[PDB]
Amino acid sequence: SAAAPQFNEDTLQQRLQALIESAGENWTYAIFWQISHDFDSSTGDNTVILGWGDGYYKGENTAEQEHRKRVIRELNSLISGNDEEVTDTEWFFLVSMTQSFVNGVGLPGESFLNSRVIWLSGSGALTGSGCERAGQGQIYGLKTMVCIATQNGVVELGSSEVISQSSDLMHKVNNLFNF
């Protein structure tokens, strides 16, 4: 934009933080893509869209860097409402907030529609996948990207490290995002 009250909801950022901070491997961030509905102006249409729900960023040229700092100051001024580097993973995390996915489309829409876990481990997996969100993340330094369908949306995890599908992490996501 300009340009681009329940339990499970008051507790969302806490559950995202808990996922990241309480995890076996080193994850860079977690994003929750939420279910929203669009209604078409021409017809009666309930279309499922996955939008930005919330996120938790943990973490671990000069031309590009000052482009980034401008945006952050511009955003700062708009939101409220002494300067150091804006890293690639931070930037990817930031820009992710403007992204949306029609159900079935893109890594999260894919994941939700099929009630699926998509686990892309290693740079080869990310780029070889041919999905642009995976390619984007790989560009920005992520070596692992995960989407886990939950009852209210999709949990996205990413890391600049290579991480194989852990059976334990699956249980974590279920405990925290179902029900």
Binding site: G55, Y57, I72, N76, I79, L94, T98
Partner: peptide, 22 residues
């Protein structure tokens, strides 16, 4: 609404940065 969730997560993102000075 999605723009609100955006504004909230962004505010928290900024705060965490503003907090490394502090």
């Amino acid at each position: 609404s999605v723009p609100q969730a955006r504004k909230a997560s962004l505010a928290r993102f900024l705060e965490k940065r503003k907090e490394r000075l502090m």
